[PDB]
Write a protein that binds this DNA or RNA. Sequence first.
DNA 1: ACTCTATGATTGATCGGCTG
DNA 2: TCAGCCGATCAATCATAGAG
Lengths: 73, 68
Amino acid sequence: RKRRNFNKQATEILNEYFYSHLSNPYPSEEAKEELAKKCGITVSQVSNWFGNKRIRYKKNIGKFQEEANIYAA
Amino acid sequence: ARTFDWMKVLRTNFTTRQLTELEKEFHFNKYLSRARRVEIAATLELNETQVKIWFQNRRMKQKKRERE
DNA sequence: ACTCTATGATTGATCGGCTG
DNA sequence: TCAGCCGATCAATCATAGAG
């Protein structure tokens, strides 16, 4: 099928949340719905983003340090 | 940053023939009896566990469809 | 326009927890 | 005690969009 990316703003919001919870990047059902409403996407798309984010992150930590440094705080 | 705990935590390739038969069964009954499980497995050349897991995953994607 | 990478989605299978 | 299910997640892979 076709794959459509997310807005720059949506990914901006997702990363900020991801790196601000790097010690435990597992949003609860409530947090997920909140992220969905703010990003303009579904809870499923939020769950996939985090699932993909986590796995790819731990697979090559070094590759995302620059990014982690940006959303650090 | 620091490497936290979560950072430290064979995949069957079903044929088109198997997926088609699995679906058919699903649409006949969402849950399978021990009897029908062994039967489908034998017919499809799979283990009961694979059949069991496929049904489990199938039910969940259904839920994720009726909810989206 | 092509090669290589980034990334959203799918899916077989695992993990902790609940239940009969 | 034990197997089946649920909900969440994992891990590998598919197919495409974007970067150089």
